[PDB]
Amino acid sequence: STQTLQWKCVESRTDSKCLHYGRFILSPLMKGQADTIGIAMRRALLGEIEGTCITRAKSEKIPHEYSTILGIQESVHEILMNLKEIVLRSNLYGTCEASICVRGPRGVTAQDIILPPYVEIVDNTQHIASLTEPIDLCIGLQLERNRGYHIKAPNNFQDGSFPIDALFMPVRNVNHSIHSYGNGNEKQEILFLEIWTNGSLTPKEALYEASRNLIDLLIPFLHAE
Amino acid sequence: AKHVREDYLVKKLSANEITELVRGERNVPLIIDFYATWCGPCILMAQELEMLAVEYEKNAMIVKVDTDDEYEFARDMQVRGLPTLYFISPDPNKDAIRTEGLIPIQMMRDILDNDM
Amino acid sequence: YGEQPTLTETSLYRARRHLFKEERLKAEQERLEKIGPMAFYSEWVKAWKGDTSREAIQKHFEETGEDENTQLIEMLSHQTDREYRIMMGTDIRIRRDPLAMRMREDQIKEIWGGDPVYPTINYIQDPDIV
Amino acid sequence: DRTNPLTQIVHGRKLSYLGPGGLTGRTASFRIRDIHPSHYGRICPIDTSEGINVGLIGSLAIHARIGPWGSLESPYYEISERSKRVQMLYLSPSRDEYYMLASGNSLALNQGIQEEQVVPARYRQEFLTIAWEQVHFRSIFSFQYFSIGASLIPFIEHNDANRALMSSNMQRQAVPLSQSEKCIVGTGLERQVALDSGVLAIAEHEGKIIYTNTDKIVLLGNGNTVSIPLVMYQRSNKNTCMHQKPQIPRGKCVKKGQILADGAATVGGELALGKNVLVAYMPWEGYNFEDAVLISERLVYEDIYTSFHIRKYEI
Amino acid sequence: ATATSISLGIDDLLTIPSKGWLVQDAEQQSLILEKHHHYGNVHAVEKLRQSIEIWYSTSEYLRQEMNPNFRMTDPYNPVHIMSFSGARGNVSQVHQLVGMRGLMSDPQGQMIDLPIQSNLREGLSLTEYIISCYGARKGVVDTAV
Amino acid sequence: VAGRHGNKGIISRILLRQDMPYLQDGRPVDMIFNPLGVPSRMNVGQIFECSLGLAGSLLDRHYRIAPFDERYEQEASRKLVFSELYEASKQTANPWVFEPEYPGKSRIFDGRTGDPFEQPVIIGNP
Amino acid sequence: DDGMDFPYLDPPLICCFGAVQKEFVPSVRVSEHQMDPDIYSGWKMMQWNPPEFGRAPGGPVSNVAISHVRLGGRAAVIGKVGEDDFGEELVLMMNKENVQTRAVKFDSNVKTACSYMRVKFSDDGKMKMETVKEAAEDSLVASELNLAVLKEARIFHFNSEVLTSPSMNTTLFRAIKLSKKFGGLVFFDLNLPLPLWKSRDETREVIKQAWEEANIIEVSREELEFLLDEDHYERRKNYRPQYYSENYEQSKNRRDYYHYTREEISPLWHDGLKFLFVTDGTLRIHYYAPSFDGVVVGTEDVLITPFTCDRTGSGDAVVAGIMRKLTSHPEMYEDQDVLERQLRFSIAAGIISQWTIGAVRGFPTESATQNLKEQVYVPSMW
């Protein structure tokens, strides 16, 4: 009889290519609903959305992880560490392959990656390698889409296939607040949400996926048995 | 003595040596630093001059004068404050430059490059 | 009793803090009923030179279908991050007493007794220096 | 001991009553295991060795110096109405107890004269409170009565002196992590510890950095060209890596003695044995009972605490 | 113990209100007596026998007034709950953070003239901290003996 | 894992980021200590550092403080810490950094209930 | 110049005329002790034991203005800068700290802090220098004087450096005439440059015209004994009786804090003077008025922080505090008790200003100055 539930986006800043922020508001929520919505949405956003990333890097003519290469200022382990931060997008479950074959004194960035048709990078200037002298540099990579943090074994040696324990975190941070509405006798409350993502997704999409994963999870009970 | 490198590059010269340097023939810009030990801001000036003397390896000559030793000579050079630098052109046609205060090193570079 | 609190008044307010805090919070909540959410949540939303009163809100609702829920949402759309972060103190479960989030800088500086005599610029470094 | 740059420095400055021609841990009395009122400017009073040999092995004060005749000396500022030239002297224990060494301040004014204000002092082997007019010497250094380990504790004046021993002893067991990070709050002595640890690579000549590779740095200055080889990966006596890293890029200049390359747990020109982490003090579920900590997953997938250990098997 | 939660800040170490007067008055009698001691009014033993007695009486008066202060003004102070409930922390131990640590002892017996008139919250001075190290050493030459 | 003030510890559990208390800006806590350890060992010097660390993390500045700063003033460390906290709370609009009713403390929430722990908790960056 | 509608703001404005410079120490003499010509790591030992003229060394007028505005007052600066990067950064530094720059004139003819001289080898082989082109700071003409700062400002403050250049002599005298026509006081600071430390008679001839126009004068202890008699006032200081002391204080060989009588400073006194201040560093401040005189007692401490102590800029803070309390409290002129009470704020500011490296980096705040004043002085004094 009094008002209807409304939700809207009140702010969205693009601080950088791989960092996006978004604040949202909900309208006349009666008691108890706001806390449940806020806590469920925070948990879902922190641990339900899935984001693809590089999981295994294969290099040519390299003995081990802690080795040096002529003409490269960055050690191999440094290259793995720098390679873990590359952000990617996809929507299909399954592992894929990728490669990077670059010449010598260039300076290698994230735009030098070669990607399958359905995978694209979001930032295009993330430093991944620095080159000084002319040496042909060829590295193969594997891309995977999982949920949450996963740790992999060092198996599948080949010449060298170093597995990077990539973190599947598309949402950097989440916050919420439950204010008061002062609706006379009836106690209403205003709920504010706040999402920081890393550019793999965007607000109003991470929120969508996080709501849908939750409504996935709550569902078995509706069926009888 | 060629075995261990000198910690400080700026060489302290007396008044007469400075007179000989200015009077005699030169081919590189000359820097004259006025300083005293009791001086407050002169430690920073000494550090900046030491840094500047490394970038300009052989293209400039940097010397310093202690006003506690040569006071009348410093007074004659129209010095009215301790953190003072004198830029001397390698040619007698161009006039000298007097800079007062704790000037930044970049302006010093501009002074002895674009004006000397 | 006089101009400055005495050592007994302070040690008594230390015992009865929560009563005064509850009175302040009750007054702040009671303000919402008369004022209305629209005008109450406008002190922290600067750069919205509207009406903020539940007399012309009804006039706007008669002019356009927006009720006293979409005008509030519209004002809460030019808030800026800092103003929202400060406004969050009126949260239903944080409950900052109104006196705390409105004290002047002079009053807050008296908690530790003014600036330090030894300047803090001697301690401050830069996290990106060698 | 090469666990971390701190331990290399700490090991060199040690004193012990043990060894040939000295006392042992069994036939040592209890008075020899106490702080005499003379190990003040010379021997740290809160850094010793726990166990049976307690009070027999200690460290040196930061400003301490072995003077003539093998006597430890400490600096003190002489107060006299002549203004000689250098007002600081290196006092020996024999000349220490016959002077009145103030440790107070001149920030106190009464309706009379300032020279009758009272400050604590140290005459003979006691602690008096005297007027400013009968003060012969005045210690002015904060890092004068402590050692290297005890001077790395911020706000040490707020910690009980009982805990200082183990606060100092738990910094020599730190593991140099893979990537280092500087401390937000410190005492300012980390810079000199890093300088003197020997882990760094300091320039021995002037000039410009004309070549850098992650195996070497080549500098050109005053004609000759100097090559400095870096330490890429090595093994410590306690099975820990020692990984250096260049600091200044190509083309820039360095004076003598300035830093050229970093080292293990030495980000910047400063010592760095740990990481800054958000912390909340609260009993969570009994999982922090007694002295238990409850860390999060963020410390294991961002490599916040991750170190390389190299073991040497010889056959 | 979680839902309620407890923590130790800087303003929860609640020094009793009357310490401002007692320490000031204790300093006055130490100033007057040490000023008359130079006039020949009193001898050395009397000066020694009093500088030990003001700071012992004052310190033991703050300690006995700690709980009545806590139990009436701030019954739920985190330091009070931790110690009064018997979980962890003696009355003497709380007195070190709140109150006075005065009258430490020289290793060969005997008290030291200089009293530690500052908390651990306020922060000891250089001479006061060094005095507190005398009792620090004979805390580890005891656990090993 | 050990601090610089003699507060040692044994890691007991490792929790996912969604299962830990978060401040009023949503940032999950990275480590949880036991408060009772402070009255026992009597090392208050950590708490100061704790609070001060927070200020640094919110101001991009590092402090190099010599010991025994209580010679210039009375309770000088308190002035330093509280002034830095207020400056960090004012320059960056985070009114939870310096709560002017229990300075240095703030009311954190529960990571698995969305409820505020009933009493304010001291947080920092040690 | 009469354009205004509403009354002026609460803190009266201060007029700061001179040259804008960064970290400048005018007063230079021959120090007896030197600490190594190369190693600057040990030069700080000359800050614990100053050469008795750099005990509280004053600096440029911009430093005084910055210290005054940082103490809770309001100041404006008149000067000229070049169209350089240094000139554009000096005004930025002054603007960042609420110093009004409405009267700072930018010009392109001359360069900031750079003056062109010429080598003029004389008889024998002693070189000389003659100013061919003047520096930007000392190139202000009377036409470009902001006739709004002068009208509003209630105290006109300038230092003796402007007396070393020809054009600024006329410009300064014109500004003084304008300010006096508008009813403002004249504050004279005697931070003597090096060339003015040559002889007493020449300096007295040089500064007489400016001295006779001043309403308030502030000089150091050495800048007064130099102006009256250096040899006599140095022989009087180092004197101990051959047989027996006189009272008892003479039997303790304490430092010499001599309060000059009104018959010794009479040659430096005139009818228009309202105050004469002689500062022995931050230790003591002797104040002389038309009807009374006295000494305010203070202290100093640079060994409290031996590694971050730098006496440069303390005199500017002392003068700025004096001006701030003069403008805030207008009853100090004829009340000795209020005068003594309000003159300890300046001492506290001067004490704080010596605890950090850099003249402008660590000027104290008003709250910090009040805190130190209350912590050092007994409640009866403060």
Side-chain angles (χ1 to χ4, degrees):
Chain A
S1 164
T2 55
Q3 314 273 30
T4 179
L5 175 83
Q6 300 195 52
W7 76 283
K8 198 161 127 35
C9 178
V10 317
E11 171 133 26
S12 67
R13 306 174 284 99
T14 306
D15 326 301
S16 286
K17 273 287 199 52
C18 53
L19 179 70
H20 295 91
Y21 160 75
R23 185 189 343 137
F24 309 94
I25 177 175
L26 269 85
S27 87
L29 274 160
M30 26 170 47
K31 315 186 42 86
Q33 284 167 354
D35 317 51
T36 322
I37 293 169
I39 192 50
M41 200 72 37
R42 179 194 162 91
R43 297 207 52 136
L45 279 149
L46 277 175
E48 294 283 350
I49 322 181
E50 317 167 352
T52 88
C53 39
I54 319 180
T55 323
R56 201 219 61 174
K58 176 182 177 296
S59 55
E60 182 205 353
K61 314 272 191 323
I62 279 169
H64 48 65
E65 275 143 332
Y66 326 125
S67 170
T68 87
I69 319 158
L70 164 146
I72 303 174
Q73 293 164 230
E74 278 184 88
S75 53
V76 163
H77 166 63
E78 270 186 29
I79 296 198
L80 280 85
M81 281 315 78
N82 284 353
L83 192 143
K84 200 158 67 134
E85 294 110 8
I86 313 297
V87 72
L88 319 151
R89 317 192 55 183
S90 169
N91 282 313
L92 320 168
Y93 300 80
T95 174
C96 322
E97 67 199 5
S99 47
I100 176 174
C101 295
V102 185
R103 284 321 161 211
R106 256 279 333 281
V108 162
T109 64
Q111 197 74 296
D112 311 312
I113 207 167
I114 287 94
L115 288 169
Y118 44 100
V119 165
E120 61 269 54
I121 59 141
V122 204
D123 122 282
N124 334 296
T125 182
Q126 269 189 23
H127 181 81
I128 176 147
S130 183
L131 264 154
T132 89
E133 304 230 15
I135 309 75
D136 39 1
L137 170 36
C138 297
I139 293 173
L141 327 163
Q142 219 171 260
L143 326 176
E144 210 163 352
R145 173 192 182 96
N146 285 10
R147 173 193 144 280
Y149 183 49
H150 284 230
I151 174 166
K152 296 94 197 160
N155 309 324
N156 205 249
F157 308 137
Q158 291 157 290
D159 163 85
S161 86
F162 307 136
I164 46 185
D165 299 289
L167 56 151
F168 299 73
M169 303 304 197
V171 166
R172 271 183 210 242
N173 266 320
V174 161
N175 185 14
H176 68 116
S177 151
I178 290 100
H179 279 107
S180 189
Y181 198 77
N183 195 16
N185 203 288
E186 177 75 279
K187 281 97 172 147
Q188 315 247 234
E189 58 211 2
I190 309 160
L191 165 79
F192 281 87
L193 290 122
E194 224 172 353
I195 305 158
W196 290 260
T197 74
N198 72 335
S200 165
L201 294 200
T202 53
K204 282 193 307 304
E205 298 189 37
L207 176 130
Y208 185 88
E209 214 77 57
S211 313
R212 219 51 205 159
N213 292 328
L214 253 183
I215 293 187
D216 259 302
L217 294 183
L218 326 161
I219 210 59
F221 313 95
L222 285 191
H223 297 201
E225 203 66 28
Chain B
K2 165 143 161 153
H3 262 297
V4 302
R5 194 52 167 115
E6 300 296 329
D7 306 359
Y8 306 99
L9 265 282
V10 180
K11 317 287 276 156
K12 175 195 196 157
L13 294 188
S14 320
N16 317 286
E17 286 156 352
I18 290 319
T19 62
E20 202 58 36
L21 254 69
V22 152
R23 173 181 292 133
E25 208 209 26
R26 299 171 319 277
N27 39 347
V28 282
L30 184 61
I31 325 286
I32 292 180
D33 187 20
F34 286 99
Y35 86 113
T37 52
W38 61 270
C39 181
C42 294
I43 294 116
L44 320 170
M45 184 54 80
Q47 295 176 14
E48 295 287 75
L49 274 207
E50 207 65 38
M51 162 56 58
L52 186 82
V54 156
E55 316 182 355
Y56 292 68
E57 298 279 348
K58 304 312 281 153
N59 318 115
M61 172 160 224
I62 297 190
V63 291
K64 66 194 185 187
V65 190
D66 183 2
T67 74
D68 300 341
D69 263 19
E70 317 283 340
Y71 186 55
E72 304 102 330
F73 167 62
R75 183 205 292 137
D76 283 349
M77 294 279 261
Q78 306 268 289
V79 164
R80 38 153 165 191
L82 252 180
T84 307
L85 282 146
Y86 259 106
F87 298 91
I88 308 281
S89 200
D91 81 60
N93 159 305
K94 236 191 173 143
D95 39 7
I97 290 271
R98 198 192 50 185
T99 64
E100 307 200 314
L102 209 69
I103 46 181
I105 177 152
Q106 187 43 53
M107 192 215 58
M108 273 189 266
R109 291 189 192 117
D110 289 355
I111 282 289
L112 82 173
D113 274 6
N114 311 14
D115 221 290
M116 200 136 293
Chain C
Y1 194 87
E3 294 264 338
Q4 266 83 3
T6 64
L7 258 76
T8 82
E9 292 155 327
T10 59
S11 67
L12 201 154
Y13 162 94
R14 181 189 291 150
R16 279 145 64 86
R17 268 183 319 219
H18 39 287
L19 310 188
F20 315 130
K21 178 164 168 299
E22 291 315 318
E23 289 189 357
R24 275 184 297 235
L25 266 166
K26 166 178 293 325
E28 201 76 340
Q29 163 78 359
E30 203 170 293
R31 216 174 90 204
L32 244 180
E33 262 71 3
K34 299 240 169 168
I35 278 297
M38 182 66 178
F40 185 86
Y41 289 114
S42 59
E43 155 174 3
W44 296 273
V45 171
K46 210 185 59 58
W48 210 81
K49 292 91 52 192
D51 191 86
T52 74
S53 154
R54 70 157 82 250
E55 301 305 82
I57 286 160
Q58 193 44 30
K59 195 184 84 68
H60 200 181
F61 177 50
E62 295 184 315
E63 295 205 27
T64 326
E66 37 201 0
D67 40 4
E68 193 217 83
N69 185 32
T70 309
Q71 324 180 36
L72 182 129
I73 287 203
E74 201 89 330
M75 143 159 47
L76 277 306
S77 317
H78 320 266
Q79 184 145 30
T80 319
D81 251 6
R82 310 169 68 88
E83 307 183 71
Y84 164 73
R85 273 187 265 147
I86 283 169
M87 177 190 97
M88 181 165 178
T90 78
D91 183 320
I92 209 52
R93 64 221 201 291
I94 301 182
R95 302 234 299 166
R96 248 188 290 276
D97 46 332
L99 204 83
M101 37 186 220
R102 311 225 175 77
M103 248 178 305
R104 291 172 269 114
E105 167 140 340
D106 318 327
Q107 317 217 58
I108 301 189
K109 277 205 161 62
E110 296 175 358
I111 284 184
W112 63 89
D115 294 313
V117 286
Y118 184 69
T120 323
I121 205 58
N122 293 13
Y123 300 142
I124 285 163
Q125 252 194 8
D126 175 38
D128 300 320
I129 72 159
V130 292
Chain D
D1 199 316
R2 325 183 90 201
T3 322
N4 45 51
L6 176 56
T7 324
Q8 304 187 22
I9 272 296
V10 166
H11 205 152
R13 305 164 45 99
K14 262 169 71 174
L15 301 143
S16 66
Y17 296 89
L18 317 182
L23 329 168
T24 197
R26 183 124 193 186
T27 89
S29 64
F30 273 30
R31 293 184 92 104
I32 208 78
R33 299 175 186 261
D34 267 276
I35 316 171
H36 195 76
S38 81
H39 316 321
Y40 275 153
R42 303 129 183 98
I43 282 169
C44 165
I46 68 193
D47 207 310
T48 177
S49 59
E50 271 207 40
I52 172 70
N53 310 347
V54 50
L56 308 166
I57 295 131
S59 271
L60 262 174
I62 271 175
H63 274 93
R65 167 196 97 169
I66 293 188
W69 311 135
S71 69
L72 292 174
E73 307 198 309
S74 202
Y76 290 113
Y77 183 95
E78 162 145 43
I79 285 184
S80 85
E81 203 223 350
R82 184 32 41 181
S83 164
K84 311 186 299 292
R85 154 92 196 286
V86 175
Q87 296 275 78
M88 291 265 268
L89 257 73
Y90 260 96
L91 294 193
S92 83
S94 75
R95 278 225 291 148
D96 194 349
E97 54 166 12
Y98 286 88
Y99 292 139
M100 267 203 190
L101 294 92
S103 181
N105 259 213
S106 291
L107 304 183
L109 277 161
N110 188 356
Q111 194 47 265
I113 88 167
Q114 198 269 344
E115 271 102 337
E116 291 166 280
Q117 304 299 139
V118 297
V119 316
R122 190 191 338 146
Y123 194 44
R124 290 313 202 96
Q125 323 217 295
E126 314 141 348
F127 277 101
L128 329 168
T129 287
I130 63 184
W132 260 118
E133 214 163 8
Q134 29 188 358
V135 157
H136 303 133
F137 282 84
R138 169 186 190 182
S139 72
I140 58 172
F141 286 143
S142 41
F143 291 133
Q144 198 176 302
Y145 298 88
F146 299 140
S147 40
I148 316 108
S151 315
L152 293 168
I153 303 161
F155 307 102
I156 196 181
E157 81 254 9
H158 292 89
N159 291 335
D160 196 291
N162 298 358
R163 287 308 270 205
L165 196 42
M166 61 205 48
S167 325
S168 165
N169 274 356
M170 299 169 355
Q171 271 168 99
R172 302 187 305 120
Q173 303 166 35
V175 186
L177 320 169
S178 77
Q179 208 212 25
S180 292
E181 182 186 1
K182 257 191 287 198
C183 43
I184 292 143
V185 182
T187 53
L189 199 84
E190 292 106 14
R191 326 171 306 204
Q192 328 221 14
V193 171
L195 194 150
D196 292 321
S197 73
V199 157
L200 262 81
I202 56 163
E204 285 145 0
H205 206 99
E206 306 106 14
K208 320 187 177 75
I209 303 201
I210 65 164
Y211 178 25
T212 175
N213 266 193
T214 170
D215 205 43
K216 72 193 280 185
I217 303 175
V218 158
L219 259 68
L220 176 55
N222 194 44
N224 49 350
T225 320
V226 182
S227 320
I228 310 84
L230 294 200
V231 175
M232 264 330 320
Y233 278 87
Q234 275 213 357
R235 204 203 58 118
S236 70
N237 296 19
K238 291 319 188 103
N239 295 316
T240 315
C241 48
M242 321 191 31
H243 170 216
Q244 287 200 18
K245 178 205 296 211
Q247 202 71 29
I248 278 174
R250 201 94 40 104
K252 283 204 204 128
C253 329
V254 290
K255 309 196 286 182
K256 186 174 189 295
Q258 284 191 7
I259 175 183
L260 280 183
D262 263 7
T266 324
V267 59
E270 280 207 337
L271 184 66
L273 307 170
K275 297 231 179 195
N276 309 287
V277 280
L278 197 68
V279 153
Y281 287 72
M282 54 164 330
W284 195 70
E285 279 286 342
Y287 281 99
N288 50 24
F289 208 58
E290 321 285 330
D291 322 67
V293 195
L294 203 162
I295 80 165
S296 95
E297 196 106 327
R298 200 199 77 86
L299 302 191
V300 305
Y301 62 71
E302 298 218 10
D303 293 328
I304 304 305
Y305 294 110
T306 284
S307 84
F308 312 135
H309 272 60
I310 293 106
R311 297 214 49 141
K312 169 177 182 183
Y313 301 105
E314 152 187 341
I315 177 168
Chain E
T2 309
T4 297
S5 188
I6 43 166
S7 293
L8 212 63
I10 301 296
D11 280 41
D12 326 299
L13 307 170
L14 197 86
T15 305
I16 87 162
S18 69
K19 185 186 174 182
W21 301 312
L22 299 194
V23 183
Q24 216 175 352
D25 267 285
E27 277 180 336
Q28 273 186 47
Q29 288 149 32
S30 292
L31 255 59
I32 282 168
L33 177 99
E34 95 154 289
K35 144 162 171 53
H36 275 239
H37 174 238
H38 292 56
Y39 293 177
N41 303 137
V42 315
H43 58 77
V45 182
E46 260 150 25
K47 198 181 91 59
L48 156 71
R49 265 205 315 242
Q50 163 160 75
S51 44
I52 309 287
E53 281 226 343
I54 312 147
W55 300 111
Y56 191 90
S57 69
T58 293
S59 175
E60 295 269 40
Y61 184 62
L62 307 182
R63 185 218 312 273
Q64 94 170 6
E65 290 285 309
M66 213 172 46
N67 300 276
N69 175 28
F70 271 126
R71 222 198 44 239
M72 294 226 55
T73 80
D74 215 4
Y76 304 116
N77 181 279
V79 198
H80 186 223
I81 284 178
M82 270 177 203
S83 71
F84 188 77
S85 94
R88 163 171 310 280
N90 291 352
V91 161
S92 162
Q93 275 183 331
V94 173
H95 183 54
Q96 321 277 336
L97 322 164
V98 167
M100 213 188 310
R101 303 192 68 198
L103 255 57
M104 299 273 158
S105 71
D106 226 308
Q108 83 264 350
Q110 278 153 52
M111 307 273 211
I112 309 174
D113 296 78
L114 226 64
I116 310 192
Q117 62 185 1
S118 43
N119 292 293
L120 284 172
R121 178 198 40 114
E122 321 197 67
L124 305 190
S125 76
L126 186 50
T127 44
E128 299 179 4
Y129 190 84
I130 279 179
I131 285 176
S132 92
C133 301
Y134 273 136
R137 177 133 302 192
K138 93 172 71 73
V140 311
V141 199
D142 273 8
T143 60
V145 171
Chain F
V1 283
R4 270 179 309 188
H5 310 268
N7 44 352
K8 219 212 264 186
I10 285 282
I11 289 112
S12 152
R13 209 180 170 186
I14 296 199
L15 289 189
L16 316 167
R17 62 184 189 157
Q18 61 254 35
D19 275 331
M20 265 212 184
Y22 59 99
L23 330 175
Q24 310 186 353
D25 56 358
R27 260 204 300 164
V29 157
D30 274 14
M31 226 182 234
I32 293 185
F33 281 78
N34 196 24
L36 280 148
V38 193
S40 68
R41 330 291 147 79
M42 276 182 305
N43 45 357
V44 191
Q46 55 184 305
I47 306 291
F48 285 115
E49 173 193 14
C50 209
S51 280
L52 198 33
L54 188 57
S57 166
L58 290 194
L59 275 166
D60 285 331
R61 45 175 73 169
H62 285 189
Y63 309 100
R64 260 63 190 148
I65 311 158
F68 306 100
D69 49 6
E70 331 278 332
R71 57 201 165 162
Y72 318 88
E73 217 161 9
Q74 216 197 1
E75 269 152 0
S77 303
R78 194 162 151 290
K79 283 197 180 189
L80 160 69
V81 167
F82 283 14
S83 90
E84 283 311 278
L85 277 192
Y86 175 70
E87 190 172 356
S89 150
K90 174 188 60 182
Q91 286 200 14
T92 87
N94 277 318
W96 53 270
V97 180
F98 182 80
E99 300 257 66
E101 34 190 346
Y102 26 72
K105 305 212 270 179
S106 47
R107 173 170 312 223
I108 64 195
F109 295 89
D110 200 354
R112 56 204 204 283
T113 317
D115 278 337
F117 293 133
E118 206 210 340
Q119 313 271 26
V121 180
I122 168 67
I123 41 154
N125 263 89
Chain G
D1 174 87
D2 306 324
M4 202 55 208
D5 37 356
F6 57 90
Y8 290 132
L9 306 116
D10 180 34
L13 200 77
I14 297 311
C15 190
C16 275
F17 175 87
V20 197
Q21 261 152 351
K22 184 171 153 206
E23 312 291 315
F24 203 47
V25 179
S27 51
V28 179
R29 311 185 82 179
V30 171
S31 177
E32 171 46 0
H33 307 317
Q34 311 151 32
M35 265 282 319
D36 201 289
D38 274 304
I39 305 184
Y40 46 69
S41 88
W43 290 2
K44 84 190 79 212
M45 297 191 80
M46 281 285 127
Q47 311 293 336
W48 315 335
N49 220 6
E52 196 44 47
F53 60 90
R55 172 163 313 261
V61 198
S62 84
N63 283 0
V64 178
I66 279 158
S67 194
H68 184 281
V69 54
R70 212 177 265 190
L71 279 161
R74 299 169 52 224
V77 177
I78 295 104
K80 164 180 275 181
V81 288
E83 278 287 346
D84 299 339
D85 317 343
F86 195 40
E88 275 290 338
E89 90 163 31
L90 276 180
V91 289
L92 177 54
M93 151 185 101
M94 277 191 335
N95 267 124
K96 259 200 243 160
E97 327 178 311
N98 312 334
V99 179
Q100 290 181 356
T101 47
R102 319 192 177 230
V104 176
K105 298 280 305 208
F106 302 87
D107 73 332
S108 38
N109 300 310
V110 278
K111 302 207 273 156
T112 311
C114 294
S115 81
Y116 292 73
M117 324 208 92
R118 196 182 25 223
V119 202
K120 199 145 297 302
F121 302 97
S122 85
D123 171 332
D124 322 88
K126 288 203 303 215
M127 332 191 320
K128 296 276 286 294
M129 300 265 168
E130 317 226 278
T131 169
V132 176
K133 190 178 193 128
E134 280 197 64
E137 50 248 18
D138 325 309
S139 41
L140 185 72
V141 311
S143 82
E144 43 212 32
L145 276 174
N146 199 269
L147 263 83
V149 161
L150 301 163
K151 202 268 177 224
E152 186 193 345
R154 306 263 62 79
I155 280 191
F156 180 86
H157 166 265
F158 71 104
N159 96 90
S160 92
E161 188 262 4
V162 298
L163 300 179
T164 65
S165 63
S167 65
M168 290 266 198
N169 221 358
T170 83
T171 301
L172 154 76
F173 284 131
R174 284 230 42 187
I176 288 180
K177 187 212 312 157
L178 268 189
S179 184
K180 280 189 167 172
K181 187 200 86 153
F182 286 113
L185 272 63
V186 170
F187 198 110
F188 190 23
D189 187 10
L190 207 79
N191 306 332
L192 293 176
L194 192 144
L196 258 48
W197 286 97
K198 195 177 151 38
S199 77
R200 159 171 42 104
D201 306 312
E202 290 182 1
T203 308
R204 290 194 73 167
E205 265 200 321
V206 159
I207 74 184
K208 158 162 195 63
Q209 210 173 337
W211 188 284
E212 302 269 329
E213 300 266 323
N215 289 350
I216 305 153
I217 304 183
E218 193 266 2
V219 300
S220 92
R221 206 202 166 170
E222 271 225 354
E223 294 168 359
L224 174 80
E225 296 168 5
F226 173 69
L227 284 186
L228 301 177
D229 212 355
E230 196 91 43
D231 294 339
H232 162 234
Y233 280 95
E234 203 74 22
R235 281 187 331 247
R236 192 218 52 97
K237 177 207 272 217
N238 312 291
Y239 150 73
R240 314 211 191 300
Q242 194 168 31
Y243 324 110
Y244 328 136
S245 298
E246 183 63 359
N247 37 15
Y248 172 78
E249 305 288 328
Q250 254 201 359
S251 84
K252 302 305 256 168
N253 308 128
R254 287 153 169 141
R255 223 179 88 78
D256 176 85
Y257 313 105
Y258 181 55
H259 180 72
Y260 314 93
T261 61
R262 286 185 71 80
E263 318 278 356
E264 298 173 84
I265 74 174
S266 178
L268 304 185
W269 189 264
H270 59 71
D271 270 277
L273 256 193
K274 260 200 246 198
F275 268 133
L276 181 54
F277 292 115
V278 180
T279 78
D280 184 16
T282 78
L283 296 162
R284 294 211 151 61
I285 294 178
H286 315 270
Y287 61 96
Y288 301 95
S291 46
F292 53 86
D293 58 334
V295 47
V296 166
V297 171
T299 180
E300 92 173 11
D301 219 342
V302 278
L303 294 163
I304 201 185
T305 168
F307 288 144
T308 70
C309 54
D310 181 291
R311 298 178 176 267
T312 298
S314 40
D316 304 333
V318 160
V319 177
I322 275 179
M323 277 191 313
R324 155 78 167 134
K325 276 289 165 297
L326 274 190
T327 52
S328 179
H329 296 64
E331 72 266 54
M332 316 188 17
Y333 288 97
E334 319 87 1
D335 208 339
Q336 205 183 2
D337 194 23
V338 188
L339 196 164
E340 276 182 346
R341 288 186 134 73
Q342 307 301 327
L343 228 58
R344 306 177 161 108
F345 184 84
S346 155
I347 289 188
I351 291 177
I352 301 172
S353 306
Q354 313 179 326
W355 284 349
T356 176
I357 296 151
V360 84
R361 196 162 86 105
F363 278 152
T365 313
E366 191 187 37
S367 58
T369 312
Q370 183 77 10
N371 281 343
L372 191 65
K373 162 189 167 139
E374 299 192 325
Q375 287 164 18
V376 179
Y377 283 100
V378 165
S380 305
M381 311 215 188
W382 73 33

